[PDB]
Amino acid sequence: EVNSCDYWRHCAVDGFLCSCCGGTTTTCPPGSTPSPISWIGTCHNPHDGKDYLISYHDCCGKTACGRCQCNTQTRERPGYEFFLHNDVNWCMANENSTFHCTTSVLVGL
Amino acid sequence: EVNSCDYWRHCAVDGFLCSCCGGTTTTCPPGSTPSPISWIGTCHNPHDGKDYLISYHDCCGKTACGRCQCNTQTRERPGYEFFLHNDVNWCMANENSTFHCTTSVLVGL
Amino acid sequence: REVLTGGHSVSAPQENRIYVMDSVFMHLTESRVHVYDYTNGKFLGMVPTAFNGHVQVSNDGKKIYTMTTYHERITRGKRSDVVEVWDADKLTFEKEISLPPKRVQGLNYDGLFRQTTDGKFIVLQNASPATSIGIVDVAKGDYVEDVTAAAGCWSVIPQPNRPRSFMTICGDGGLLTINLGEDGKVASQSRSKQMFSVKDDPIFIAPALDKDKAHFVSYYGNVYSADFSGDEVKVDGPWSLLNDEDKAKNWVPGGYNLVGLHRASGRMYVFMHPDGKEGTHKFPAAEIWVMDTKTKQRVARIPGRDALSMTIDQQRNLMLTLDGGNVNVYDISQPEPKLLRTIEGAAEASLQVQFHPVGG
Amino acid sequence: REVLTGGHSVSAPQENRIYVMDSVFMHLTESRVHVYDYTNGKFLGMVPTAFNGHVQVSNDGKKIYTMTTYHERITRGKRSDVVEVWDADKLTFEKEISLPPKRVQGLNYDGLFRQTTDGKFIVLQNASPATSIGIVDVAKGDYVEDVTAAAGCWSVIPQPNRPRSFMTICGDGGLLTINLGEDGKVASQSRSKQMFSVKDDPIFIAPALDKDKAHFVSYYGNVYSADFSGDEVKVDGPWSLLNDEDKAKNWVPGGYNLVGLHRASGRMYVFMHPDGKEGTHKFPAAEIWVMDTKTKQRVARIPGRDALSMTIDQQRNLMLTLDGGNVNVYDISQPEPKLLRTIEGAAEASLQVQFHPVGGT
Ligand SMILES: N[C@@H](O)Cc1c[nH]c2ccccc12
Ligand SMILES: N=CCc1c[nH]c2ccccc12
Structure with missing residues (x-):
C-alpha cells in the first residue's frame, strides 16, 4: 500500500518513493x-x-533511485507559493544536492 | 541503410552508430x-x-548518443587480442574519455 | 582510404533547428539538450548539461547558453553552479561563468532561465531556498547582480518592448518589474496592483507573451493580463476560457509550458482537459484550444496528443508540442492548427522545446 | 509527530545481499551498483559509480570497492581514475585511492577488478591502450606500481591457494603468473606453455575457478585447464563440451561472465546456444549446461532464460544468472539446478552480479 502513488499521504509527491528505494516513508x-x-x-x-x-x-x-516514480499534485501550487511547490529539488540546500528519493512525513492535522 | 545494425561495414560495432547521432560513418x-x-x-x-x-x-x-545501439561481433576476439576487441571503450586514451558514438571507417581490402 | 575527422558544424541551417531539453530524470546527472531538424525529424547533435541542466539560445542565434550544477565527485565534494556558453554551430564548449551556489534546480519552465531583449544579460532564477534573480553579463562573462527585491517572487518574463526589463510573479498576486542599467545592476523597479488572487485563482507561471503585454491562464480556466506598454504595468482579469458547456464538463488548463501566443493574429494556444478538479493542473492535454484574445472567445479546438509543453515560432507560423518524449510540429498560419509531423523519441523526459531564433 | 532520519544500515543481513552492477550504458556517466535481497527480491540500496563503474566486495565482507573515472567537468577537465572504499552496511563513502589515468574502461567482466586471496591487494586491469596490471595496497590506501610484465595480456585470475598470486591470459595463448611480495611489487613470475591456439580456438576469459585449477571454455565449445597446484602452471586441453548430437546442432558457448564452477562437486556451468557460427559468442543462453569436469560429461541441461552472465555461491550452493535486466536465483545443490525466483528490473544494463561474501576462509 505505501509503495503505491495512490497511498493517501503521497498526495503531493513528485519523485521516487523512498520506501521503494531501501528506505521507508520516514527514513532515508x-x-x-x-x-x-x-x-x-x-x-x-x-x-x-x-x-x-x-x-x-x-x-x-x-x-536517482529510479523506483516508484510518482507525480501527484493535490493542493500543489507554483513557485510564487514556494513551500507548496513540487517542481523544484528540495535537496537544493543540502551539502550534496543530487536527488535520490522523496519521503512523506506526517506533521499533524 | 547505413543507420541499420545489419549494414555490412558495422560487423563489429559495439556502441551507437555515429550516423544516427548527427555525424556520418566517417565523421564525428x-x-x-x-x-x-x-x-x-x-x-x-x-x-x-x-x-x-x-x-x-x-x-x-x-x-552517450543513445541512438542506433548495435552489438555485432563478426571476428571479434577477447582482450588478449586487444585491437580486435570491442567490449572496451576505444575513447580510453582521449583527453576526455566519455563515449559518444562509434564510426565505421573503411581502411581497405 | 577513409579518414575520420572532427571539427564539423551542424549539418542543417539554423532556421531548421529545435532544442529539446532532456532532463533524463531517471538519470538526472546526465541531462542534455538534443538538437533536431524540425523539417524532417533528423537528429543533429547534442549538448551535455550534467545535473538538471537548463538551456536557451542567444537572441542573436550564435550561441547556446546552458545552466547546470557540478560537484567535484558528483555526489560529494564542492558544488559549482555555472552558466556555459557553447558555439551554436560547432556545438562546442567556449566559456564557463561562475554563479553563486543557489541556481534553481527544478523542471524546465522557460521562465527560470531567460535573457534581456537586447541579449546582453542572462536573467536566471535562484533559490537557496530564499528566492532572488541572478544577472549575468554576457560580454564580461560575469555574475553582476543579485536582485533580492524579487524575494518571494518566481520566474522571469522579459519585456520584448524594452532592452533590459523583465517581470516576475510575486506572492502578493502582482508583478514586480525590474529595469536593468547598462551595467546589469538594477536601475529601477515597480510593483503592479494585485493581478490575481493567489488563494482563490492561482495562475500558471507560463506567459502567453506579446510585444507589450502578457496573458496568463489560471487553475480554473481564467485569463489574466499584464499590459507593459508603459513604465507601470497595468493588470486586469479575469475573463473565462470557458463557455457554459465547457464548465459543465469541468474543462480546465493543464501542463507545464502550457500556453503560447501567435503575435500577428492574437491567437492564444492552451492545453486543456476535461473533468478538472484539485490536483489535475499538470495533466496532459486532451485538447489544444485556440482563443481569440481580442474577442475573448474560443475559435478552434483540436486533439491534444497528450502534450504537456509547447512553444511558438512567429515567423514561420509554427507551434511545437511535446508529450515528454515526442515532438509534434504544427502549422498555425490559419486558425485551425495542422499537424505536419511527429518526431518520435526526441527525449526520454523533456518538458521544454525551443526553436533556434531567426529574428536576430 | 514523525521525524525523518538518515544514518541507517541496510535492512537485510549481509548473507541475503547481492550486487547488480548496472552500467546504465544509455547514460554511462551515472552507472551504479544496485543492492538486492536475493531471498525476496527487495531493493536494499545503491552505490553511485559515475562513468562505467566496476565493483567487488572485500573478501572479509566489510567493504565495497568501486573503480571509476571522474573529470572535473565530466566531459571536459582533468581526469581522476580512482578506487573507492565504501562501508558495506551503511553504503557510505569512506576513502578514495588515486590510480594512474588508465584504468580499464569496458564491460564488467569479473577479471578486470579483483583482489588477492589474502585481501591485502586490489588487482585491476590497465589499458592506455598498452596493457598492464595495477596493484592497490589496501592497508596503505595507495597505488603500488604497474605490473609491466603483463603487457599483451588481459584480465586477472586470482589463485585461491596462494595469498598474493594471480594469473593473466596472454596473446601467446599461455598464462602469465605473478607472485607479489608483501609490498605489492612483483616478487616472482612464470609463463606457462601455450594452452590454446589463439587463431584456431580462442577461449572466453571468464574462468571456471577452483582452488588450485581453472577451466576455460572456447568459442567452439572446447575446454582448457590450468592447474596451479605447483609453482609452475601446467596446461591441458582441449576436451569437448559437445556430444555428436550437440555438434550436429552446432551448440557453442555464449555470454560474458558465462561460466561458473561449483567447487565441492566439480560441476561446471556454462551458457550455451545452438546454430553457432562466427559472431555468436556473446549470444544469450538458450540453455545452461551443467558439466561434470571429472567425468567430462554433461549431467544436466535447462532453459537459459536468455542469460548472459552468472555467479556461483560455494557457501549456499546457489547460482545467479542475469539477462541484462533481470536476475534469476537457482539452487544448485543437486546436478539439476532448480529455479527459485526471478528479480525483475534489477538493472537497466548489467552484465555482472555478485553475492555478498559469506565465509570463504
Ligand atoms: N521532490 C523533488 O525534489 C523531486 C524533483 C522535482 N523536480 C526536480 C528537479 C530536479 C531535482 C529534483 C526534482
Ligand atoms: N566501441 C565500444 C564502446 C564501449 C563498449 N564497452 C564500453 C564500456 C565503456 C565505455 C564504452 C564502451
Whole structure:
C-alpha cells in the first residue's frame, strides 16, 4: 500500500518513493541524507476522515533511485507559493544536492 | 541503410552508430572528438564478395548518443587480442574519455 | 582510404533547428539538450548539461547558453553552479561563468532561465531556498547582480518592448518589474496592483507573451493580463476560457509550458482537459484550444496528443508540442492548427522545446 | 509527530545481499551498483559509480570497492581514475585511492577488478591502450606500481591457494603468473606453455575457478585447464563440451561472465546456444549446461532464460544468472539446478552480479 502513488499521504509527491528505494516513508535509504527543507502537502486520510499536513523531505547525495516514480499534485501550487511547490529539488540546500528519493512525513492535522 | 545494425561495414560495432547521432560513418557529430586508436573488424562486402578492414574509431567527449545501439561481433576476439576487441571503450586514451558514438571507417581490402 | 575527422558544424541551417531539453530524470546527472531538424525529424547533435541542466539560445542565434550544477565527485565534494556558453554551430564548449551556489534546480519552465531583449544579460532564477534573480553579463562573462527585491517572487518574463526589463510573479498576486542599467545592476523597479488572487485563482507561471503585454491562464480556466506598454504595468482579469458547456464538463488548463501566443493574429494556444478538479493542473492535454484574445472567445479546438509543453515560432507560423518524449510540429498560419509531423523519441523526459531564433 | 532520519544500515543481513552492477550504458556517466535481497527480491540500496563503474566486495565482507573515472567537468577537465572504499552496511563513502589515468574502461567482466586471496591487494586491469596490471595496497590506501610484465595480456585470475598470486591470459595463448611480495611489487613470475591456439580456438576469459585449477571454455565449445597446484602452471586441453548430437546442432558457448564452477562437486556451468557460427559468442543462453569436469560429461541441461552472465555461491550452493535486466536465483545443490525466483528490473544494463561474501576462509 505505501509503495503505491495512490497511498493517501503521497498526495503531493513528485519523485521516487523512498520506501521503494531501501528506505521507508520516514527514513532515508542508507547513505542518503535528509533535506532540512521541504514542500508541504495537505492530504486527506480516508481511514479516519481527517486532513493532515505532510512534509515531503527529500533524501539527497545519491543518484536517482529510479523506483516508484510518482507525480501527484493535490493542493500543489507554483513557485510564487514556494513551500507548496513540487517542481523544484528540495535537496537544493543540502551539502550534496543530487536527488535520490522523496519521503512523506506526517506533521499533524 | 547505413543507420541499420545489419549494414555490412558495422560487423563489429559495439556502441551507437555515429550516423544516427548527427555525424556520418566517417565523421564525428559536432563537438565530439575522434579517437586516435580503435578496434578493427574484418567485414564481408555482400556486393563484391570481398572482405575489408574496418576501423571502429569512437567519437568522444560527449555523453552517450543513445541512438542506433548495435552489438555485432563478426571476428571479434577477447582482450588478449586487444585491437580486435570491442567490449572496451576505444575513447580510453582521449583527453576526455566519455563515449559518444562509434564510426565505421573503411581502411581497405 | 577513409579518414575520420572532427571539427564539423551542424549539418542543417539554423532556421531548421529545435532544442529539446532532456532532463533524463531517471538519470538526472546526465541531462542534455538534443538538437533536431524540425523539417524532417533528423537528429543533429547534442549538448551535455550534467545535473538538471537548463538551456536557451542567444537572441542573436550564435550561441547556446546552458545552466547546470557540478560537484567535484558528483555526489560529494564542492558544488559549482555555472552558466556555459557553447558555439551554436560547432556545438562546442567556449566559456564557463561562475554563479553563486543557489541556481534553481527544478523542471524546465522557460521562465527560470531567460535573457534581456537586447541579449546582453542572462536573467536566471535562484533559490537557496530564499528566492532572488541572478544577472549575468554576457560580454564580461560575469555574475553582476543579485536582485533580492524579487524575494518571494518566481520566474522571469522579459519585456520584448524594452532592452533590459523583465517581470516576475510575486506572492502578493502582482508583478514586480525590474529595469536593468547598462551595467546589469538594477536601475529601477515597480510593483503592479494585485493581478490575481493567489488563494482563490492561482495562475500558471507560463506567459502567453506579446510585444507589450502578457496573458496568463489560471487553475480554473481564467485569463489574466499584464499590459507593459508603459513604465507601470497595468493588470486586469479575469475573463473565462470557458463557455457554459465547457464548465459543465469541468474543462480546465493543464501542463507545464502550457500556453503560447501567435503575435500577428492574437491567437492564444492552451492545453486543456476535461473533468478538472484539485490536483489535475499538470495533466496532459486532451485538447489544444485556440482563443481569440481580442474577442475573448474560443475559435478552434483540436486533439491534444497528450502534450504537456509547447512553444511558438512567429515567423514561420509554427507551434511545437511535446508529450515528454515526442515532438509534434504544427502549422498555425490559419486558425485551425495542422499537424505536419511527429518526431518520435526526441527525449526520454523533456518538458521544454525551443526553436533556434531567426529574428536576430 | 514523525521525524525523518538518515544514518541507517541496510535492512537485510549481509548473507541475503547481492550486487547488480548496472552500467546504465544509455547514460554511462551515472552507472551504479544496485543492492538486492536475493531471498525476496527487495531493493536494499545503491552505490553511485559515475562513468562505467566496476565493483567487488572485500573478501572479509566489510567493504565495497568501486573503480571509476571522474573529470572535473565530466566531459571536459582533468581526469581522476580512482578506487573507492565504501562501508558495506551503511553504503557510505569512506576513502578514495588515486590510480594512474588508465584504468580499464569496458564491460564488467569479473577479471578486470579483483583482489588477492589474502585481501591485502586490489588487482585491476590497465589499458592506455598498452596493457598492464595495477596493484592497490589496501592497508596503505595507495597505488603500488604497474605490473609491466603483463603487457599483451588481459584480465586477472586470482589463485585461491596462494595469498598474493594471480594469473593473466596472454596473446601467446599461455598464462602469465605473478607472485607479489608483501609490498605489492612483483616478487616472482612464470609463463606457462601455450594452452590454446589463439587463431584456431580462442577461449572466453571468464574462468571456471577452483582452488588450485581453472577451466576455460572456447568459442567452439572446447575446454582448457590450468592447474596451479605447483609453482609452475601446467596446461591441458582441449576436451569437448559437445556430444555428436550437440555438434550436429552446432551448440557453442555464449555470454560474458558465462561460466561458473561449483567447487565441492566439480560441476561446471556454462551458457550455451545452438546454430553457432562466427559472431555468436556473446549470444544469450538458450540453455545452461551443467558439466561434470571429472567425468567430462554433461549431467544436466535447462532453459537459459536468455542469460548472459552468472555467479556461483560455494557457501549456499546457489547460482545467479542475469539477462541484462533481470536476475534469476537457482539452487544448485543437486546436478539439476532448480529455479527459485526471478528479480525483475534489477538493472537497466548489467552484465555482472555478485553475492555478498559469506565465509570463504
Ligand atoms: N521532490 C523533488 O525534489 C523531486 C524533483 C522535482 N523536480 C526536480 C528537479 C530536479 C531535482 C529534483 C526534482
Ligand atoms: N566501441 C565500444 C564502446 C564501449 C563498449 N564497452 C564500453 C564500456 C565503456 C565505455 C564504452 C564502451
